[PDB]
Amino acid sequence: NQQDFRTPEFEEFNGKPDSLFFTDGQRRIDFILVYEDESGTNEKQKRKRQAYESNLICHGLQLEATRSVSDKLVFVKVHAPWEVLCTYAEIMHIKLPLKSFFNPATRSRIVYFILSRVINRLVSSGIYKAAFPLHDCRFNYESEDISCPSERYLLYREWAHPRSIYKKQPLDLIRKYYGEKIGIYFAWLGYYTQMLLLAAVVGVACFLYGYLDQDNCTWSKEVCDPDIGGQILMCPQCDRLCPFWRLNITCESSKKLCIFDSFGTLIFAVFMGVWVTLFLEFWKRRQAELEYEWDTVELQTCGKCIRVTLCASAVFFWILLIIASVIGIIVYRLSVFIVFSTTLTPQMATSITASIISHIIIMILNTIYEKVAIMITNFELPRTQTDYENSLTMKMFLFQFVNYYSSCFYIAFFKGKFVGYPGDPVYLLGKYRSEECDPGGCLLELTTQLTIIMGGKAIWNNIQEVLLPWVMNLIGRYKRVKITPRWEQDYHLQPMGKLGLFYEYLEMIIQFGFVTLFVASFPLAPLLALVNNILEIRVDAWKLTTQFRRMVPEKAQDIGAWQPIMQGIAILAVVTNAMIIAFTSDMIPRLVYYWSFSIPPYGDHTYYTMDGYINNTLSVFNITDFKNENPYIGLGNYTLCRYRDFRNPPGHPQEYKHNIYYWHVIAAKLAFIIVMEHIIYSVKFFISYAIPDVSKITKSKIKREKYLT
């Protein structure tokens, strides 16, 4: 309980480069503690470190220290004798196999438990420079020792190296080497990849059906027609800066719509609801199977309400701030301002530099959000580590959810919806002319945004994720910080800090939200997600195996707080897809025209048809602007312009007002929303109620194991 003595066997030796044992070689190394003490504060640090070491030795752990070959750095090897391992395996209910005994992962876990009981506070408060377990050997080179298995080498060769991208991951080996948390994360990623493969095959089928039926979409042919669509003049989208544009300029865009706005996309949206339900249920079954196999199950007021309300209010305030930041696209404006202030076509180079600066600002904002969430959680800390982790997960996920989906939601649901008509357009404030929809359409803009986020941004994210730890290691290597032992080699690696796997989970949860919430836009989201995940498994494995210092293995029977998050995203996905199809997409007006507006009562066609849809939906507008300016007159000599709305034509008794067509279309949209939501929710409830939570084989295996034990 006192600093009776220092670490015994204080001697230096690094002759063996791949030695995981002590100088004698009988007992292996289960932990390494790195500190520098040779050079008022220094004496206090020395005293505290000596006291901690003496207390640790008093518990039975064997510690011995060696100075670094390259001085003022001291590495203390920590090993647990057999009696200590047995007593703390009796204390901590570890399911050993009963018909070298403990694999190094569980040995390191036990030693870390011992360090925690009497380490994190010391490391944080400059007492210890580092504290970490040891890898077997270099990932690319076999271990010199023959007795010691180089399972890190095999893990790199068959699972982490890109040459083995097609091989299924050795999840048992991953769980054995890194622990249950990493293993369950990678198992979930693989299962997600398989389900994405299924959804991607179905989505490609629907996309191909839409693609083959391309020349037979009448409205696009009318749009591209120089007569039907070439003689339609559209009102300007802004004051004295947008010109009267004919519809022909959207012709190419219209073609893309016939591939992304068709009944195939609706069928695929229904199938995607079903697929999300199946994904959740079969993940529950697989999670139960993993719980059985890996034995992951183990056992170890007014003021509070006011604090909770205050923290929730602060979270809501910062969420609003992030909403304003993203919708206000202030990052791009700031990047442009910085580029202009600071100083092979110049346009593309300037765009690339602006994008790079925007990405840097984005990552800085992300770490700012992390800091804010940490501060808020500390402000309302319940001091329970699991509860603290869940609360921080929820806060950070909300921040990232807003930061990533605010632009998409604005494009889908709030961009161009409230614009009025060219006469008396809506002005929110002194700021004028709330932006209207793009000439191609809001659905096409949303599809383009999703393609950019899922196609290029995912690749750039993977490249940055694979290069950042490598660069951080390379700068240390060039910093000069000849043969090097194992502990020093692992010391010069980037330590995966707290909530390291949290970001890996968060990236995939954001991808899942992109795939499910906005699947009504384009059916190729599952395919892009599939490609990204196939790359992501290997990039995460490679960066964890090589570039990152080994973490203490943990245990977890589930992905954690992400399960309710995914369930909530699944619930929200039905509503979001229904809204996108009804509001963002133009399929409902086309269907209504085909079934109600082309018949004799409201048309001149004897049977249902789609021709004339373009000419019979664009409301006319004579140039009579309210003087509450009238920018149209100065632009050109045009007299009548047609806009995308269902107002009454000029000269009507109630002109520029919603007619029967508008309310019929609105009723159709709302009825579609209600029908789709109710049908999809009923199907999801039936599927969840008709699927066992645990696997059929797992029940029998558990029963047999209980019978035999």
Binding residues for Ca(2+): 465, 504, 507
3-state secondary structure 537-593: HHHHHHHHHCCEECCCCCCCCCCCCHHHHHHHHHHHHHHHHHHHHHHHCCHHHHHHH
Sign for the CA dihedral angle at 522, 527, 533, 536 comes to negative
Instruction: Indicate which single residue of 654, 706, 707, 709 sits in contact with a copy of itself (rule: CB under 8 A).
Output: 654
Which range in 95-103, 216-224, 569-577, 685-693 contacts Ca ion by CB under 5 A? 685-693
Q: Which stretch binds a copy of itself (CB under 8 A): 324-332, 403-411, 615-623, 656-664?
A: 656-664
Give the three-class secondary structure for 31. Answer: strand
Distance CA 48, CA 602 (A): 89
148/394 with CB nearer a copy of itself: 394
Residue 53 near Ca ion by CB under 5 A: no
Q: Which does 504 bind (CB under 5 to 8 A by kind): Ca ion, a copy of itself, none?
A: Ca ion
At its nearest, how many Å lie between Ca ion and the CB of residue 466? 8
Does position 657 bind a copy of itself by CB under 8 A? yes
399-418 b/e (C-beta count within 10 Å ≥ 16 → b): bbbbbebbbbbebbbebbee
Provide, rounded to whole angstroms, the least separation between the CB of residue 664 and a copy of itself.
Answer: 5
Contact flag: residue 666 with a copy of itself (CB under 8 A): yes
Give whichever of 47 and 657 is closer to a copy of itself, judged by the CB atom.
Answer: 657
Residues 522 to 581 in contact with Ca ion, rule: CB under 5 A: 536, 540
Q: Which of residues 270-309 bind a copy of itself (CB under 8 A)?
A: 301
Pick from 58, 201, 670, 697 the residue near a copy of itself by CB under 8 A. 670
87, 366, 461, 473: which one contacts Ca ion (CB under 5 A)?
A: 461
Residue 673 contact, options a copy of itself, Ca ion, none, Cβ 5-8 Å cut-off depending on partner type: a copy of itself
Residue 103 touches which of a copy of itself, Ca ion, none (CB < 5 to 8 A by kind)? none
Residue 191 or 410: which CB sits closer to Ca ion? Answer: 191
With binding defined as CB under 8 A, does residue 349 bind a copy of itself? no
Of 53, 64, 291, 504, the one binding Ca ion (CB under 5 A) is 504
Nearer to Ca ion, 18 or 504 (CB): 504
Does 671 bind a copy of itself (CB under 8 A)? Our answer is: yes
3-state helix, strand, coil in the chain (%, to 5): 60, 5, 35
667 near a copy of itself, rule: CB under 8 A: yes
Q: How far is the CB of 585 from a copy of itself (least distance, A)?
A: 17
Among Ca ion, a copy of itself, none, the one that 323 touches (CB under a kind-dependent 5 to 8 A) is none
Give the whole-angstrom CA distance, residue 466 versus residue 454.
18
Q: How many of the other CB atoms lie within 10 Å of CB of 614?
A: 22
Quickly list DSSP for 461-496.
HHHHHHHHHHHHHHHHHHTT-----HHHHHHTSEE-
What is the number of other CB atoms lying within 10 angstroms of the CB of residue 541? 24
Q: How far apart are CA 316 and CA 73, in angstroms?
A: 47
Choose among a copy of itself, Ca ion, none what residue 3 binds, the Cβ cut-off being 5 to 8 Å by kind: none
State the nearest-atom distance from the C-beta of 660 to a copy of itself, in Å: 4
Report helix, strand or coil for 619: strand
| Continuous segment of H or E residues that includes residue 260 | helix 251-260
CB of 687 to Ca ion, least distance (A): 8
Q: Toward a copy of itself, which CB reaches closer, 87 or 659?
A: 659
Which of 696, 707, 708, 709 contacts a copy of itself by CB under 8 A? 696
* Stretch in the footprint of a copy of itself (CB under 8 A) among 351-359, 520-528, 619-627, 670-678: 670-678
3-state secondary structure of 263: helix
151 makes contact, choosing from Ca ion, a copy of itself, none, with CB < 5 to 8 Å by partner type, with none
β-pairing, 494-495 vs 548-549, is parallel
Number of alpha carbons in the 13 Å side-chain half-sphere of residue 322: 26
- Return the number of the residue (432 or 595) whose C-beta is nearest a copy of itself: 595
* Sign of the torsion formed by the C-alpha atoms of 197, 201, 206 and 212: positive
In the complex, least distance from residue 30 CB atom to a copy of itself, rounded to whole angstroms: 34
Three-state secondary structure call for residue 35 = strand
Per-residue contact track with a copy of itself, 566 to 585, x per CB under 8 A? ---------x----------
Residue 472 CA to its chain's centroid (Å) = 23
If one asks whether residue 693 binds Ca ion (CB under 5 A), the answer comes out as: yes
Q: Check binding of 705 to Ca ion (CB under 5 A).
A: no
Interface with a copy of itself (CB under 8 A), residue from 48, 67, 307, 664? 664
Radius of gyration (C-alpha) of the chain in whole angstroms: 32
**How far is the first Cα of the chain from the last one, in angstroms, to the nearest whole number?**
42
DSSP lists the bridge partners of residue 415 as none
For CA atoms 450, 456, 459, 463, the dihedral sign is negative
Nearest distance in Å: CB 644, a copy of itself: 19
The yes or no reply on residue 686 touching Ca ion (CB under 5 A) is no
By the 10 Å C-beta count (0-12 exposed, 13-18 middle, 19+ buried), 451 is classed as middle
List the single partner that 465 binds among a copy of itself, Ca ion, none, CB under 5 to 8 Å by kind: Ca ion
12 near Ca ion (CB under 5 A): no
Binding at 601: pick from Ca ion, a copy of itself, none (beta carbon under 5-8 Å per type): a copy of itself
Binding site, by residue number, is: 465, 504, 507
Query: Any idea what DSSP says for residue 250?
Result: G
Q: Which is nearer to Ca ion, 339 or 539 (CB)?
A: 539
Residue 659 as a binder of a copy of itself (CB under 8 A): the answer is yes
Cα atoms found within 13 Å of the Cα of residue 577, Cβ hemisphere only:
33
Sign of dihedral through CA atoms 625, 627, 629, 633?
positive
659 binds, among Ca ion, a copy of itself, none (CB under 5 to 8 A by kind): a copy of itself
Binding mask 586-625 for Ca ion (x = CB under 5 A): ----------------------------------------
Please report, for residues 168, 336, 397, 561, 681, the alpha-carbon distance to residue 509 in angstroms, rounded to integers and kept in the order given.
22, 31, 9, 11, 22
Measure Cα distances from 191 to 58, 184, 350 in Å.
47, 10, 41
Of the candidate residues 242, 691, 694, 702, the single one contacting Ca ion (CB under 5 A): 691
Which range touches Ca ion (CB under 5 A), out of 71-79, 116-124, 145-153, 499-507?
Answer: 499-507
Per DSSP, the three-state class of 621 is strand
Q: Which residues bind a copy of itself (CB under 8 A)?
A: 301, 575, 601, 654, 657, 659-660, 663-664, 666-667, 670-671, 673-674, 678, 696
Q: Which residues bind Ca ion (CB under 5 A)?
A: 461-462, 465, 504, 536, 540, 691, 693
